[PDB]
Design an enzyme around this catalytic site. Structure first.
Site, PDB file in Angstrom:
ATOM      1  CG  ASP A  50      34.500  68.868 -23.039  1.00  0.00           C
ATOM      2  OD1 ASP A  50      33.621  68.305 -23.662  1.00  0.00           O
ATOM      3  OD2 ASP A  50      34.317  69.972 -22.540  1.00  0.00           O
ATOM      4  CB  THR A  51      34.750  64.979 -27.899  1.00  0.00           C
ATOM      5  OG1 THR A  51      33.429  64.708 -27.426  1.00  0.00           O
ATOM      6  CG2 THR A  51      35.664  63.815 -27.582  1.00  0.00           C
ATOM      7  N   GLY A  52      33.511  67.918 -26.867  1.00  0.00           N
ATOM      8  CA  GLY A  52      32.695  69.023 -27.321  1.00  0.00           C
ATOM      9  C   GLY A  52      33.343  70.385 -27.075  1.00  0.00           C
TER      10      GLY A  52
HETATM   11  C1  LIG Z   1      34.658  74.751 -22.566  1.00  0.00           C
HETATM   12  C2  LIG Z   1      34.350  75.710 -23.743  1.00  0.00           C
HETATM   13  C3  LIG Z   1      35.646  76.283 -24.318  1.00  0.00           C
HETATM   14  C4  LIG Z   1      33.481  75.083 -24.841  1.00  0.00           C
HETATM   15  N1  LIG Z   1      33.225  76.037 -25.875  1.00  0.00           N
HETATM   16  C5  LIG Z   1      33.424  75.839 -27.183  1.00  0.00           C
HETATM   17  O1  LIG Z   1      33.944  74.822 -27.605  1.00  0.00           O
HETATM   18  N2  LIG Z   1      33.029  76.813 -28.031  1.00  0.00           N
HETATM   19  C6  LIG Z   1      32.280  78.000 -27.603  1.00  0.00           C
HETATM   20  C7  LIG Z   1      33.313  76.724 -29.429  1.00  0.00           C
HETATM   21  C8  LIG Z   1      32.058  76.352 -30.153  1.00  0.00           C
HETATM   22  C9  LIG Z   1      31.246  77.318 -30.722  1.00  0.00           C
HETATM   23  C10 LIG Z   1      30.137  76.913 -31.425  1.00  0.00           C
HETATM   24  C11 LIG Z   1      29.876  75.567 -31.521  1.00  0.00           C
HETATM   25  C12 LIG Z   1      30.745  74.701 -30.900  1.00  0.00           C
HETATM   26  N3  LIG Z   1      31.822  75.064 -30.230  1.00  0.00           N
HETATM   27  C13 LIG Z   1      32.126  74.616 -24.324  1.00  0.00           C
HETATM   28  O2  LIG Z   1      31.572  75.120 -23.358  1.00  0.00           O
HETATM   29  N4  LIG Z   1      31.594  73.619 -25.013  1.00  0.00           N
HETATM   30  C14 LIG Z   1      30.278  73.085 -24.724  1.00  0.00           C
HETATM   31  C15 LIG Z   1      29.447  73.036 -26.011  1.00  0.00           C
HETATM   32  C16 LIG Z   1      28.930  74.376 -26.407  1.00  0.00           C
HETATM   33  C17 LIG Z   1      29.570  75.116 -27.380  1.00  0.00           C
HETATM   34  C18 LIG Z   1      29.110  76.364 -27.703  1.00  0.00           C
HETATM   35  C19 LIG Z   1      28.018  76.866 -27.045  1.00  0.00           C
HETATM   36  C20 LIG Z   1      27.364  76.120 -26.083  1.00  0.00           C
HETATM   37  C21 LIG Z   1      27.816  74.869 -25.763  1.00  0.00           C
HETATM   38  C22 LIG Z   1      30.449  71.683 -24.280  1.00  0.00           C
HETATM   39  O3  LIG Z   1      29.155  71.165 -24.042  1.00  0.00           O
HETATM   40  C23 LIG Z   1      31.361  71.379 -23.110  1.00  0.00           C
HETATM   41  O4  LIG Z   1      31.274  69.986 -23.081  1.00  0.00           O
HETATM   42  C24 LIG Z   1      30.903  71.822 -21.732  1.00  0.00           C
HETATM   43  C25 LIG Z   1      32.077  71.574 -20.768  1.00  0.00           C
HETATM   44  C26 LIG Z   1      31.797  71.926 -19.306  1.00  0.00           C
HETATM   45  C27 LIG Z   1      31.575  70.923 -18.362  1.00  0.00           C
HETATM   46  C28 LIG Z   1      31.316  71.240 -17.042  1.00  0.00           C
HETATM   47  C29 LIG Z   1      31.268  72.545 -16.628  1.00  0.00           C
HETATM   48  C30 LIG Z   1      31.493  73.554 -17.545  1.00  0.00           C
HETATM   49  C31 LIG Z   1      31.757  73.248 -18.875  1.00  0.00           C
HETATM   50  N5  LIG Z   1      29.708  71.072 -21.281  1.00  0.00           N
HETATM   51  C32 LIG Z   1      28.634  71.672 -20.731  1.00  0.00           C
HETATM   52  O5  LIG Z   1      28.536  72.888 -20.668  1.00  0.00           O
HETATM   53  C33 LIG Z   1      27.512  70.788 -20.207  1.00  0.00           C
HETATM   54  N6  LIG Z   1      27.517  70.873 -18.755  1.00  0.00           N
HETATM   55  C34 LIG Z   1      27.695  69.808 -17.958  1.00  0.00           C
HETATM   56  O6  LIG Z   1      27.627  68.665 -18.372  1.00  0.00           O
HETATM   57  N7  LIG Z   1      27.914  70.033 -16.675  1.00  0.00           N
HETATM   58  C35 LIG Z   1      27.995  71.412 -16.174  1.00  0.00           C
HETATM   59  C36 LIG Z   1      28.048  68.908 -15.759  1.00  0.00           C
HETATM   60  C37 LIG Z   1      29.465  68.723 -15.276  1.00  0.00           C
HETATM   61  C38 LIG Z   1      29.844  69.319 -14.075  1.00  0.00           C
HETATM   62  C39 LIG Z   1      31.145  69.240 -13.643  1.00  0.00           C
HETATM   63  C40 LIG Z   1      32.024  68.568 -14.455  1.00  0.00           C
HETATM   64  C41 LIG Z   1      31.546  68.002 -15.631  1.00  0.00           C
HETATM   65  N8  LIG Z   1      30.291  68.031 -16.051  1.00  0.00           N
HETATM   66  C42 LIG Z   1      26.137  71.224 -20.697  1.00  0.00           C
HETATM   67  C43 LIG Z   1      26.054  71.247 -22.232  1.00  0.00           C
HETATM   68  C44 LIG Z   1      25.041  70.325 -20.089  1.00  0.00           C
END
Ligand SMILES: CC(C)[C@H](NC(=O)N(C)Cc1ccccn1)C(=O)N[C@@H](Cc1ccccc1)[C@H](O)[C@H](O)[C@H](Cc1ccccc1)NC(=O)[C@@H](NC(=O)N(C)Cc1ccccn1)C(C)C
EC number: 3.4.23.16
Lengths: 99, 99
Positions: free
Chosen positions: B25-27
Site C-alpha cells: 500500500d503506497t498510500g
Molecule cells: C493504513 C493507515 C496507516 C494509513 N494512514 C496513513 O498513512 N496516515 C494517516 C498518514 C497520513 C496522514 C496524512 C496524509 C497521508 N498519510 C491510511 O489509512 N491511508 C489511507 C490514506 C489516508 C491517509 C490519511 C487520511 C485518510 C486517508 C490510504 O488510502 C490507505 O490506502 C487505505 C488502506 C486500507 C484499505 C482497506 C481497508 C482499510 C484501509 N485505503 C483506504 O482507506 C481506501 N479504502 C479501500 O479501498 N477499501 C476499504 C477497499 C478495500 C477493502 C479491503 C481491502 C482493500 N481495499 C479508501 C481511501 C477508499
C-alpha cells in the site's frame, strides 16, 4: 517516471481545470478527492477505511490528468483529509509496482 | 516483480511463523496487521485513516518476509479491515511506482 517511496507519493493532478496534489495509492480501490463542486449528477455513497466509513458523492466519468496522463473514471468527493488516487485511475495510466 | 493494479495488490507475508496476505500500500505510511500475538513487547498507539482512528499495539524490530524479501521494522497490530504493508517496509524491499 519512477516514484520512490521515501516520501509520500504526491503528484499534481489537473481536475476540472485546476491543479491539486494527490497521493498515488495502490491500496485504494477508488479515488477520493477533497470537497469541491463539480457540475454534474452524483450519487450518494459510503466508503470505508481504517477507522470507519464516510459519506461521499460519486461522480462518474471524470477526466483527470496525472503527470500528463489522462484517465477517465469515477471520483468520490467528500470530506477527506487527503486526495487519493486509487487503482481505478492508476490502471489507466499504466502504473505498476516493481520490486 | 512487476505488479499491475487491475486487481488488489496482495501478497503473502510470513511473520511470527505465520503466513498471511497483505496489501502493498503506497498510500500508507505505516504497516497495520490484524490482531495477532507476536513475540515481543509493545506500546499502545493510535493510527488513523478515513473514518478516524484506531488503537493498535506497536511492535518494533519485527522480521517480516514479503514475497521472499526480508524487512525488519515496525509493525502495528490492531482491528483493521485489511492487512496493509505501508511505506515503512516497502522501501526496505526496494519497491517503486512506475509509469
Ligand atoms: C493504513 C493507515 C496507516 C494509513 N494512514 C496513513 O498513512 N496516515 C494517516 C498518514 C497520513 C496522514 C496524512 C496524509 C497521508 N498519510 C491510511 O489509512 N491511508 C489511507 C490514506 C489516508 C491517509 C490519511 C487520511 C485518510 C486517508 C490510504 O488510502 C490507505 O490506502 C487505505 C488502506 C486500507 C484499505 C482497506 C481497508 C482499510 C484501509 N485505503 C483506504 O482507506 C481506501 N479504502 C479501500 O479501498 N477499501 C476499504 C477497499 C478495500 C477493502 C479491503 C481491502 C482493500 N481495499 C479508501 C481511501 C477508499
Amino acid at each position: 517516471p519512477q516514484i520512490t517511496l521515501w516520501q509520500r507519493p504526491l503528484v499534481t493532478i489537473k481536475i476540472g481545470g485546476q491543479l491539486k496534489e494527490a497521493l498515488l495509492d495502490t491500496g485504494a480501490d477508488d479515488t477520493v478527492l477533497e470537497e469541491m463542486s463539480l457540475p454534474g449528477r452524483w450519487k450518494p455513497k459510503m466508503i470505508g477505511g481504517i477507522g470507519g466509513f464516510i459519506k461521499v458523492r460519486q461522480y462518474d466519468q471524470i477526466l483527470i490528468e496525472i503527470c500528463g496522463h489522462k484517465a477517465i473514471g469515477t471520483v468520490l468527493v467528500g470530506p477527506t483529509p487527503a486526495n487519493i488516487i486509487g487503482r481505478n485511475l492508476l490502471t489507466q495510466i499504466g502504473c505498476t509496482l516493481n520490486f
